[PDB]
Amino acid sequence: QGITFSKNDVEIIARETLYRGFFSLDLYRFRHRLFNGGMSGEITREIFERGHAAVLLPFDPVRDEVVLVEQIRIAAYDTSESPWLLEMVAGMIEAGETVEDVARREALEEAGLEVGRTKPILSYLASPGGTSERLSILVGEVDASTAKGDIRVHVVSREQAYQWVEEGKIDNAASVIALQWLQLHYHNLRNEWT
């Protein structure tokens, strides 16, 4: 079956910016259809607005290796042993840029990686109870033996990277989603990129 209602079954009455700095905190005021058939009353929700991002999983299909980038993310501090995380290449998307354009650029800049073919993985909402942020992931064909370049660049086997997901050593959403997808799809990907 699936979801019942569409973007046309909600009325956004007004938006209000409660905080504006590098990012924003907005208040949405809205009403929406109910499953029974009625119309909700007026609801307000706080929403963290920080734009949207492109993510690239660098995968070498011949070596069966991924490239990860390590750097500090201070928001991890309170719930992690260390705030230095192993992550995918990623960048914010500015007006007029494509996901692929940003993903290729950041792969070159962050990890010194020239990307061959790309393929979409998935596009996901990071945490839609409280933020609008959407991240669109591509897998990018790389030669992992060329990975060069603060930030530290790591080359590891696909199996090792996935075991690190299982063990909680990689535990940021973008990387977890990308590496789980790779564990499910690497056979067909290796075939396609031969």
For 1-52, list the strands marked E by DSSP: 10-20, 24-32, 43-49
Among 60, 65, 106, 133, contact with a copy of itself (rule: CB under 8 A): 133
Residue 4 region, left (φ>0) first, then alpha (ψ -120 to 50), else beta? alpha
Q: Within 82-121, which residues bind ligand ATP (CB under 6 A)? A: none
Q: Applying CB under 8 A, does 117 fall inside the site for a copy of itself? A: no
Phi, psi (degrees; rounded to nearest 5) at 134: -115, 140
Q: To the nearest whole angstrom, how small is the minimum distance from the Cβ of residue 10 to a copy of itself?
A: 6
Query: Does residue 118 interact with a copy of itself by CB under 8 A?
Result: no
Coil vs helix vs strand at 37: coil
- Restricted to residues 12-41, the positions that interact with a copy of itself (CB under 8 A) are 12, 18-19, 21-23, 25, 28, 30, 32, 34-36, 40
Write the DSSP assignment of 82-117 as a string of letters: -SEEEE-EEEEPPTT--HHHHHHHHHHHHH------
Q: Which range binds a copy of itself by CB under 8 A, 5-13, 96-104, 109-117, 139-147?
A: 5-13
Instruction: Report which residue type is found at 98.
Output: T
Residue 173 CB, nearest approach to a copy of itself (Å) = 4
Q: What backbone torsions phi and psi does residue 9 show, to the nearest 5 degrees?
A: -95, 15
Q: Give the number of other Cβ atoms within 10 Å of residue 44's Cβ.
A: 11
Task: Answer with the entry of a copy of itself, ligand ATP, none that 74 interacts with (C-beta below 5 to 8 A by kind).
Answer: a copy of itself
Of 32-71, binders to ligand ATP (CB under 6 A) are: 45-46, 71
Q: Does residue 129 touch ligand ATP according to CB under 6 A?
A: yes
Which residues are annotated as part of the binding site? 46, 73, 90, 106, 110, 129
